From TrEMBL, chain A:
One of its GO terms (cellular component) is cytosolic large ribosomal subunit. Binds to the 23S rRNA. Gene3D superfamilies: 3.100.10.10. The gene is rplO. InterPro entries: Ribosomal_uL15, Ribosomal_uL15/eL18, Ribosomal_uL15/eL18_sf, Ribosomal_uL15_bac-type, Ribosomal_uL15_CS. Residues 83-142 form the Large ribosomal subunit protein uL15/eL18 domain. This is Large ribosomal subunit protein uL15. Belongs to the universal ribosomal protein uL15 family.
UniProtKB/TrEMBL annotation, chain B:
It holds the Pfam family Ribosomal_L4. Part of the 50S ribosomal subunit. It comes from the Bacteria. It comes from Vibrio natriegens NBRC 15636 = ATCC 14048 = DSM 759. Belongs to the universal ribosomal protein uL4 family. Keywords: Ribonucleoprotein, Ribosomal protein, RNA-binding, rRNA-binding. This is Large ribosomal subunit protein uL4. One of its GO terms (molecular function) is structural constituent of ribosome. Gene3D superfamilies: 3.40.1370.10. The keyword 4Fe-4S does not apply.
From TrEMBL, chain C:
The keyword Ribosomal protein applies. This is Large ribosomal subunit protein bL20. InterPro entries: Ribosomal_bL20, RIBOSOMAL_L20_CS, Ribosomal_protein_bL20_C. SUPFAM superfamilies: Ribosomal protein L20 (SSF74731). GO terms for cellular component: ribonucleoprotein complex; ribosome. One of its GO terms (molecular function) is rRNA binding. Binds directly to 23S ribosomal RNA and is necessary for the in vitro assembly process of the 50S ribosomal subunit. It is not involved in the protein synthesizing functions of that subunit. Belongs to the bacterial ribosomal protein bL20 family. GO terms for biological process: ribosomal large subunit assembly; translation. Keywords: Ribonucleoprotein, Ribosomal protein, RNA-binding, rRNA-binding. The gene is rplT. CDD domains: Ribosomal_L20. It comes from Vibrio natriegens NBRC 15636 = ATCC 14048 = DSM 759. It comes from the Bacteria. The lineage of its organism: Bacteria, Pseudomonadati, Pseudomonadota, Gammaproteobacteria, Vibrionales.
TrEMBL record, chain D:
Coiled coil: none annotated. PROSITE patterns: RIBOSOMAL_L35 (PS00936). One of its GO terms (biological process) is translation. One of its GO terms (molecular function) is structural constituent of ribosome. Keywords: Ribonucleoprotein, Ribosomal protein. Belongs to the bacterial ribosomal protein bL35 family. InterPro entries: Ribosomal_bL35, Ribosomal_bL35-like, Ribosomal_bL35_CS, Ribosomal_bL35_sf. GO terms for cellular component: cytosolic large ribosomal subunit. This is Large ribosomal subunit protein bL35. The lineage of its organism: Bacteria, Pseudomonadati, Pseudomonadota, Gammaproteobacteria, Vibrionales.
Amino acid sequence: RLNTLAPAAGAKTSAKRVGRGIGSGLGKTGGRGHKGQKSRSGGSVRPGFEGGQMPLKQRLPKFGFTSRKSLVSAEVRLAELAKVSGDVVDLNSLKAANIITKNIEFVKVVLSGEINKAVTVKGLRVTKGAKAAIEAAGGKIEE
Amino acid sequence: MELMVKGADALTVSETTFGREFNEALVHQVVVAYAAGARQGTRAQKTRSEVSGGGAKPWRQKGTGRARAGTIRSPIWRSGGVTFAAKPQDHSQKVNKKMYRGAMKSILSELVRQERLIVVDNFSVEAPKTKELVAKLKELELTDALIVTSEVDENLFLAARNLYKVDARDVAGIDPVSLIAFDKVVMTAEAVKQVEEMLA
Amino acid sequence: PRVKRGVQARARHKKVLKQAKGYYGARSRVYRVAFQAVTKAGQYAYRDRRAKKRQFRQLWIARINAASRQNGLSYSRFINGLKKASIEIDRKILADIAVFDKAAFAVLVEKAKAAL
Amino acid sequence: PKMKTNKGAAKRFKKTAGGIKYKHATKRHILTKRTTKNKRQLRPNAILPKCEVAAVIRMLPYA
RNA sequence: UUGACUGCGAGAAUGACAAUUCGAGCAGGUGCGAAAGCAGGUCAUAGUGAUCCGGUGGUUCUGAAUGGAAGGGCCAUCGC
RNA sequence: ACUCCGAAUACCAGUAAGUACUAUCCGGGAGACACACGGCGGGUGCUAACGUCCGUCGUGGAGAGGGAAACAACCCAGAC
RNA sequence: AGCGGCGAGCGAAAUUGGACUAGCCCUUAAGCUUUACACACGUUAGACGAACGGUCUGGAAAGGCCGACGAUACAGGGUGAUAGUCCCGUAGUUGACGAUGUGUGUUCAGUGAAAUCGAGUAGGGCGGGACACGUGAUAUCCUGUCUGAAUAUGGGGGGACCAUCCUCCAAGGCUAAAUACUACUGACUGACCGAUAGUGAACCAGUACCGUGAGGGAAAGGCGAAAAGAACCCCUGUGAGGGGAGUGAAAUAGAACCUGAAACCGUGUACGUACAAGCAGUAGGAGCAGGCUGUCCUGUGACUGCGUACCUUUUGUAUAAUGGGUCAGCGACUUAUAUUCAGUGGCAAGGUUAACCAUCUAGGGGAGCCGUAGGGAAACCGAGUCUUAACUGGGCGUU
């Protein structure tokens, strides 16, 4: 049977080998064309370079800032609250479920999917729609 | 499913483990990974930089009538570098845990259908003697066989060393290639049940 | 793994060299010249397989014209005659007849004349 | 190595569901002479045209 | 007299792109007219300069223990 | 670089038949951005140049075959 | 996140998963080093070490055929071809007088050590430097220069700065493990090379050789199983070289030595060729010569048609543009990591683990990453959101 195994059709594909004659269709220039910077070894052009016209990444203005809170904040889907083990949905229980990473400080629960258990959400913010769904499944939203 | 144990009654087994369809693309991938896993990847060639010498420009850029050279260790030159000299590689492939188990199940299923999986009630060798094991094998009418027990006795390990195409493996130590490689797979019924839990 | 090219490299060179048997000088001995030679021989052979069909037909037409004019009709008039007589014998056959059976050619010419 | 982000591109081009969002040019100085219409219509952020995207994506490998 | 309005804008023109152009109508507040109306500069088409950095005013969005503040942002605007 | 006039064409749009895998959109990969001659409309030049610069169509480029003695770019014609 | 002619680029931490873990003293410690005394404990020459005959082919048997036999030993090597059983080994079992190393105690003599809890110190000004951080609003650290406290009622830090609060106690020390590396020694391994490769170097190689010197830096492996390396004879200069003879399975294996390609050079034979103009062929084609037996095969090719190499580079090359004397050998899209797209497979609203652990391609390991919601500069809101006083609206999203 070690002589009988074979990959799926489509699974394996021979790599492109430039510069092995005319028949291959990749002879001579190896699909680089004729002359110029781009045909040269190490001749790539930096993405965003536009021939020396003021690039798009400089003719357009910078805008905005990053809040620090954004970096320690995490939205939680209502469907994910399933994964929590126990009734109390808090930052520690979310972290234990790996729903939020351990550096998360602030959580908003959002109406995505459905809650099928009664959970008490303490400490976290909830959307009106999620609150409704929690309360509809016999949950509470503690403060 | 039901497996016909010898020296006992038929053993009920999971149809997921022993009745799975044979996914050849899955088995082929895992088998290939395994073989890549075995590679050592210990080689190297020298590049122009790593070959001895080659600092000085062989002769002046213009005037000599010769083709321009910069180093006697150009890859063009005899005794020169390899343009793309190898260095030691890791040919290991990730296999997903489910993909490994899936392959393993596919293989065991195919063994069953091909009547290569031979379930025995027990398989023990009394002394650490090759000669005894050869006899036992002859009772089972198999010369080339992997012998999977729940735990490998010293005696059976020792009795199998000098035998070619006879390996004694614990359920832990069974591999995708070995199940394929040996002509028959002689499992003790305990080991069957252990393999079942191992593979889901 | 390292691959040495020798054995296969020679086989290619030998194939070409064997095709260049009979050429003058380098063209049968030296791979660089032989290769060029065997390529141009293939090019000529392609061009000539076409042009063979032209050369042979010119020859036939020349022979048919000879024979027709010995029988008192131009090639141009003879072909028209035959066309009008609904005789669909090819130039290759006509020219064969003009050489090997002069009498039959004359018959065909007489038939051709009648049609004109 | 890990691809590095072009921080110039990052500070000017933000990925949304609706595509790469950007601030219009020409709203920094020399505004008196400009029309309130023109200034007003430049104030909303825009989505990059298709031709501008491929590059930006190569400059924002993780965005 | 201050419509050389503020927020917007169906829908188009025109550009590789950046950008450039026209625009009914809606909201708010306004001027002229008895009124229908007209008015978002000028008969129209030139009168111009990206980004960065920085300045001034506003906002009070952010802002690293907390409360402030600095510094960022956003809006208006200035400096080729 | 005048217009009391004013075509053919071309273009835009609609309607309709027949023929055609066409048009469009979103992705992966390019290459190219030295063009040449010929016809036609022109600028430039001397209505010189195998000149030069545009428009448009053809061929060459990347196209063999037949013709034009020989002749990329003309005439005929597209080589499984 | 930040830094950055905010360009090119540079690039953290908080926090979290692991490996390893250990603290101990200036009223004098832990550790370290020495010293001996013990004891353990290992190393250092090694020893024994299973089991095959017959027959066939052959120069030779390890091969074939037939039938045996060992295996805790079928690692590996050698032997006239390819050996579990011929040999050396291997598995396993044993061996150290003495000498070493190690770890424990038990001692010694030191060291730690700066003594005594930290003032020219902290902080400051000026100039620099280091911190991801380019002086920026720039905290912190180091300090060349000039200064200069407080001293637990005190002082340091918490990214300008201030208050509050929290946290720590600088200006004295020592400290294993987890970490880095291997010129050297041993064993073992290889989808590493196999003599233009692999080391520069398989060979008397850092040699020859080159250079005043620093320094540079080669080429060069293979008779045979065994030298059995050719007694003797003959030609020749008591040569070189050869022919016999002999050796050998083989001597076009004879030391200029396995195989023995090509370029290149010869001898012989067939055919052509001394009135004929050029990319040397091609399509056709007589004659001649060999076979086989003339609508065959082979070789040659009078004569006719057609026909200006190749590569490169170009609008365009027979070009009198480039490159190539020829042959053989070698010589150019790789590898690692990350991003993205596609195919394929697994699993599927989930998918997947990383280091590490591990009886080690298993299994553990959930840190993390991607998906599952978007809008907004942002707070924040959220199937919506942003804009605006508010949209009849409009942007993006929803499905």
